[PDB]
Design a binder for this molecule. Structure first.
Ligand SMILES: CCCCCCCC
Length: 205
């Protein structure tokens, strides 16, 4: 996990597309080791969005050098259908996926738990869901999240799984905190970009 840290933000806060996609491409495979096929569709959504942005990038790497480039070029390229189109739309959903991972991990690292059920991660996943995803989900997808939530492993097993290995829980969390530095900064920059370009949409699914 700290074998594939995201690069720090450069001074101009512009995120290079290629290295960003390479970096986040290492996240989806962590879903295979949560212990349930319930996560298979979840992995597909994130992967699918990464693939969709990569494919737009591959048509003109120079034109789409940065993520900013993607949003502004597609704004010009598409007119009225933007921002509900192309790599812009893919990245709008990707960022929420990544933000969910961010809030989930930070909650774990911050020692947030249910005093009553302390070896579960339901409260952490629930907060992540509320902050990142829930307001863009209709009632049906929300009830599906609630069902999917029980496929969550214990905190102990999830952390041991991320050590895929000879290492204490405290060591593992410190590596995760390290990862979260440039991850969070990068995700924040992307959310800021959607706000400044007025590319953020609020429709539910
Ligand atoms: C460099 C990005 C490659 C696309 C990977 C798709 C999702 C894992």
């Amino acid at each position: 996990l700290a074998e594939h840290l995201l690069k720090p933000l450069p001074a101009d806060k512009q995120i290079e597309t290629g290295p960003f996609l390479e970096a986040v491409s290492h996240l989806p495979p962590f879903f295979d080791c949560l212990g349930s096929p319930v996560f298979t569709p979840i992995k597909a959504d994130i992967s699918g969005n990464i693939t969709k942005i990569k494919a737009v990038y591959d048509t003109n790497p120079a034109k789409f050098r940065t993520l900013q480039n993607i949003l502004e070029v597609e704004k010009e390229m598409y007119g009225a259908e933007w921002p509900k189109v192309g790599a812009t739309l893919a990245l709008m959903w990707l960022k929420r996926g990544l933000r969910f991972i961010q809030v989930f991990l930070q909650s774990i690292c911050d020692g947030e738990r249910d005093e009553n059920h302390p070896n579960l991660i339901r409260v952490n996943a629930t907060k992540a869901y509320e902050m990142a995803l829930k307001k863009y989900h209709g009632w049906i997808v929300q009830k599906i999240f609630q069902a999917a939530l029980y496929a969550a492993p214990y905190k102990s097993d999830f952390l041991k799984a991320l050590s895929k290995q000879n290492v204490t829980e405290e060591e593992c969390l410190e590596k995760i905190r390290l990862f979260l530095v440039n991850y969070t900064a990068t995700i924040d920059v992307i959310y800021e970009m959607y706000t400044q370009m007025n590319a953020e949409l609020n429709y539910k699914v």
